Design a protein around this ligand. Structure first.
Ligand SMILES: Nc1ncnc2c1ncn2[C@@H]1O[C@H](COP(=O)(O)OP(=O)(O)OP(=O)(O)O)[C@@H](O)[C@H]1O
Ligand SMILES: Nc1ncnc2c1ncn2[C@@H]1O[C@H](COP(=O)(O)OP(=O)(O)OP(=O)(O)O)[C@@H](O)[C@H]1O
Ligand SMILES: Nc1ncnc2c1ncn2[C@@H]1O[C@H](COP(=O)(O)OP(=O)(O)OP(=O)(O)O)[C@@H](O)[C@H]1O
Ligand SMILES: *[C@@H]1O[C@H](CO)[C@@H](O)[C@H](O)[C@H]1NC(C)=O
Ligand SMILES: *[C@@H]1O[C@H](CO)[C@@H](O)[C@H](O)[C@H]1NC(C)=O
Ligand SMILES: *[C@@H]1O[C@H](CO)[C@@H](O)[C@H](O)[C@H]1NC(C)=O
Ligand SMILES: *[C@@H]1O[C@H](CO)[C@@H](O)[C@H](O)[C@H]1NC(C)=O
Ligand SMILES: *[C@@H]1O[C@H](CO)[C@@H](O)[C@H](O)[C@H]1NC(C)=O
Ligand SMILES: *[C@@H]1O[C@H](CO)[C@@H](O)[C@H](O)[C@H]1NC(C)=O
Ligand SMILES: *[C@@H]1O[C@H](CO)[C@@H](O)[C@H](O)[C@H]1NC(C)=O
Ligand SMILES: *[C@@H]1O[C@H](CO)[C@@H](O)[C@H](O)[C@H]1NC(C)=O
Ligand SMILES: *[C@@H]1O[C@H](CO)[C@@H](O)[C@H](O)[C@H]1NC(C)=O
Ligand SMILES: [Ca+2]
Ligand SMILES: [Ca+2]
Ligand SMILES: [Ca+2]
Ligand SMILES: [Mg+2]
Ligand SMILES: [Mg+2]
Lengths: 330, 330, 330
């Protein structure tokens, strides 16, 4: 039948176009692909002045609010803090969250099984005028974090600046690239701010802009902590010039249920010696932590992947022809 | 022959069941899978009181034994420490390991090529009553770590509490999940300990339980250091409700030969100013390094993977039928 | 035709050797492969003495120039530093890089939009004899990074010693390995330096040798910072003894353009209390960031991958025979 042969030739040309256009060209079969080794450095620029009640103003700079100082892909920026200063070791009242005692007989000498705050001496001492708590041995100024400041102390960190330097290298093709592309210059970095459409290559990011692109509000996050993830994609074709290779930045907000464990917080202490006595300042910091992940793949023309793709296409063509012949046989 | 056709139809139905059940249903070929972006936060709750010989009691809290105080997937929990306090710069005797001298002529001014402890002034000064060492310029109190306390100072850290908050997000399908699930509530988080069978969803882990699940005794590791790895798997099917998505926690113990460099140890110093002089307290810490790795994928139904799997199954069926016909022809 | 059958048998034997030799033996298709969980610890041993102008000699040890003192795969080794000591919070002249004022009217009370150095009080005070800058409320000793020392202060770090402890475990085959192979012993670790050909198994690395293997000169990097990446490959065959499993070390230099943001640098501060006043010492550190990445494969013989490879080879053989018959028919 003539129409049967026409349909056969149609299937032939269809599978030919499929194997020549989709596999070979669209999927870049004619090339070999390799991954990269990446290194990320972060630098924050911004200053925050916080005026605590009954205390002098405190200035926080790059060395203050960025917790990992050397610089890492995962870093925490301080947004709010509860400060307990002049902590010294002694026998003193514990926090009421641990337990409340009405008499000394209720207290038991030892340490609490869970969430221990110290070694209970065995006496019930008044924590304040109303309630009394067990006397424990430890840092006498107890961090009381029941009250969290509604306005963020380091609210200016909403619009500070962040510079991310990402250096990637493909060793298979021996090609090293950096986020500071040829289009980016010094005068550009002097005044540019990153934008999704306007300034994609600008390496200067605003923290509030990053949080908004992630899908979260900075003010709510700065109150109790947050998690933002920055993904850097280096997908490019090495057949073209190296100037075409440009990184793509994506922002995601990692959040959970608000009623259970909201935000991100940690406790750190600074130890010093004053008047011959060892003391420490404790800080419970709620901040927005940024995790940077870089993933990229470089593909360059090679003869062996091309030959393998040609062989696979010939095999698929043969299988399709055999299946079409079996269908026409009925 | 009828038996030939029976065997042919048998092979046909076998390969049909294979392509319809294994590749499609079992391997979830109709679904497409995507990776996740994950962030991990750790919080330690526990307190250790250490009484050193000829020194007042020392209290260690979350700020103390957690050196990555900011919060990272890889963190070290202090289990034992050797303390050298009141280190000041000056010309003093070095450790015997660097070298033992009997006269000043044996000493050579300069710095050691390997394991340099300081700048040798060139005079042999008595390190103690028996042996004499080269005088070097540096921290005068030299840390002597020949004696390691057999009972772990922070042995209570065996049964402290650890809270791990893991937030994962699959960008393609735009689904965000957290280690805390609907089954987990606040009252549950108040009092629960993780177990492989009893409490698989409890986010509170005991350090001793974590180490024992890794096949390691807590005492021997805490004495000289250890390495524990926690892997979090988020394998789930997005065709069902998100409530079914639950993570799986697995514990591994990374250990080496005991005679050659046993355990994990590091050294850190705290600098301060006392009486107008800059001094420091040095600590050689033997602890357990916890490395947290999160790996998971999400699979959801899609039409293009379904069509590709159907095409591949039809092709495999055709190839199998052709091979069976060729075998029957022989 | 006889030659037709000869060519058919030739194609048959060729595809048979291909499926049995390349797909089965060469690619190890009969072996199933699994990944590993790895942990890396770093220890630096070196001493550097720096004599600043008008200041006493400063000694830097492992606790000093290793800012990630706890021990991480990514660590920074200090090579040069600019020190601004005795910083106190007050009203003082700002750095001239922010702005230069000729009168008090030019100053505006508030904070700078970009690169803010403090809160301007609206007064123009002389920064030095020639120029005047805006008066800001912050740390009064201003870090002036215009002059960078041409010779690296911590130049000795060129030939210090780095020890890496890498513990890997393949969970599927429950096999744990460490970089301290059977060939390496304690006496060997006492005196050895890693070499690409001479001492591949020695776990002691010289920083200068590591940087030179990455194609970078240590002097120019130590002057203003650098980035080195160490990759550890654990590819091995579990069919043989575990002694044959040995790690391979590769070094990659991650560098960028020199005119635009050269090297790696960061700022850190040490806070203390002197004479009842809280002060801090600021340090701008230019160092070499070492990023350690470990990736490995373990292959062990299994029956199911063997059967799958045999089936795939039989299918490819059948397809090749069918295609050859179709070509001969033409
Ligand atoms: N977080 C940031 N926000 C805005 N600009 C930045 C930031 N980090 C760096 N820059 C700008 O990028 C340029 C190159 O950065 P580089 O790493 O060389 O810093 P630097 O000049 O050594 O340090 P500093 O900027 O403190 O003098 C600098 O001139 C600086 O002004
Ligand atoms: N390591 C831990 N061990 C036991 N319980 C913990 C731990 N970390 C947190 N929790 C409990 O989980 C609950 C929610 O955790 P969240 O991150 O909000 O702690 P928090 O309330 O900010 O810190 P804290 O309980 O110290 O004030 C808290 O009520 C706390 O009691
Ligand atoms: N960075 C390094 N350079 C040279 N040798 C090292 C280095 N780190 C460790 N070693 C040597 O390897 C041996 C085993 O390492 P181990 O982890 O036991 O060190 P350690 O004895 O705990 O610490 P230290 O040697 O500082 O007292 C030690 O005897 C030490 O001399
Ligand atoms: C004392 O502390 C408890 C702690 O919960 C608090 O409820 C109470 O209001 C406090 N009383 C006063 C007078 O501050
Ligand atoms: C937002 O950025 C602007 C810069 O024009 C700044 O004036 C403002 O204070 C920033 N907002 C906050 C809350 O800091
Ligand atoms: C600086 O970079 C920008 C990139 O947007 C470019 O348009 C501009 O021409 C550059 N400046 C110079 C002087 O090349
Ligand atoms: C002196 O120190 C050396 C160091 O090895 C030690 O062997 C010796 O016993 C010490 N002597 C005394 C009296 O402490
Ligand atoms: C183990 O946990 C129990 C809690 O019941 C505690 O009493 C005990 O002290 C812990 N062991 C150590 C060595 O801390
Ligand atoms: C708390 O969580 C546990 C999980 O085991 C569950 O059994 C219990 O019902 C929950 N409590 C409430 C009040 O929902
Ligand atoms: C004052 O500081 C400026 C800052 O750029 C500098 O150019 C100038 O040479 C300095 N003058 C003196 C006398 O130090
Ligand atoms: C290089 O190593 C040698 C060891 O023989 C040492 O003498 C020299 O000081 C080192 N170079 C530097 C710059 O430290
Ligand atoms: C120490 O290790 C080296 C590895 O190069 C080996 O040649 C030597 O025999 C070992 N020493 C002993 C005593 O086994
Ligand atoms: Ca860190
Ligand atoms: Ca750190
Ligand atoms: Ca002090
Ligand atoms: Mg609380
Ligand atoms: Mg030692």
């Amino acid at each position: 039948n003539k129409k049967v042969g026409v349909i056969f030739r149609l299937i032939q040309l269809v599978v030919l176009v499929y194997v020549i256009g989709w596999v070979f060209v669209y999927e870049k079969g004619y090339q070999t692909s390799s991954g990269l080794i990446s290194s990320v450095s972060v630098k924050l620029k911004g200053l925050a002045v916080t005026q605590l009640q009954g205390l002098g103003p405190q200035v926080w700079d790059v060395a203050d609010y960025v917790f990992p100082a050397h610089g890492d892909s995962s870093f925490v920026v301080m947004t709010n803090f509860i400060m307990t200063p002049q902590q010294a070791q002694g026998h003193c009242a514990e926090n009421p969250e641990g337990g409340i005692c009405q008499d000394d007989s209720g207290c038991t000498p030892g340490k609490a099984e869970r969430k221990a705050q110290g070694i209970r001496t065995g006496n019930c001492v008044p924590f304040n005028g109303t309630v009394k708590t067990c006397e424990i041995f430890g840092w006498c100024p107890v961090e009381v974090d029941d009250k969290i400041p509604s306005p963020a102390l380091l609210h200016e960190a909403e619009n500070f600046t962040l510079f991310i330097k990402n250096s990637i290298s493909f060793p298979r093709f021996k090609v090293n690239r950096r986020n500071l592309v040829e289009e980016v210059n010094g005068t550009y970095m002097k005044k540019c701010l990153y934008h999704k459409i306007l300034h994609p290559l600008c390496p200067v990011f605003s923290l509030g802009y990053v949080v908004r692109e992630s899908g979260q509000d900075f003010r709510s996050l700065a109150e109790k902590g947050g998690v933002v993830g920055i993904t850097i994609d280096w997908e490019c074709d090495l057949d073209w010039h190296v100037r075409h290779c440009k990184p793509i930045y994506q922002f995601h907000g990692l959040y959970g249920e608000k009623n259970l464990s909201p935000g991100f917080n940690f406790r750190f202490a600074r130890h010093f010696v004053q008047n011959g006595t060892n003391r420490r300042h404790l800080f419970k910091v709620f901040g927005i932590r940024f995790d940077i992940l870089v993933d990229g793949k470089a593909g360059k023309f090679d003869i062996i992947p091309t030959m393998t793709t040609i062989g696979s296409g010939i095999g698929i063509f043969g299988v399709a022809t055999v299946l079409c012949d079996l269908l026409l046989l009925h």
